[PDB]
Specification:
part of a larger assembly, 2 chains, 72 residues, mainly alpha, 2 helices, Multidrug resistance protein MexA (chains A, B), transport protein, antibiotic efflux pump, periplasmic adaptor protein
Amino acid sequence: PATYEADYQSAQANLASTQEQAQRYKLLVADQAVSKQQYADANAAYLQSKAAVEQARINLRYTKVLSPISGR
Amino acid sequence: PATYEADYQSAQANLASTQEQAQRYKLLVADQAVSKQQYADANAAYLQSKAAVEQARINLRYTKVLSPISGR
């Protein structure tokens, strides 16, 4: 898992970033401080990130092959 | 007064502009959405304009030489 682990954290880094970006453009909407059409692209990236992380997470997990049943 | 009148209106135009700029940046520095150094500059210009306008107004007014006393 050297890599899957790398990607998974490389991702989370990203999400943590875009997620802040979004949340900020949000509160800053009710001030024109952030247009409605921008808090769109920002929330766009945020959703993509959130998706990448879930995929990375999924792959990393498959890295540890588990046994489906109890037996021999 | 062709010119004094021109300058005065040339000024007022300016003030109306910078004034808006200021009033706006104010509510935007109140959201960290704008540098603190910037809003300062904006209110700087606004003040300069307001000053310019007053001087223009004064000069225009002197364009009409009135009589100080009643007499002959």
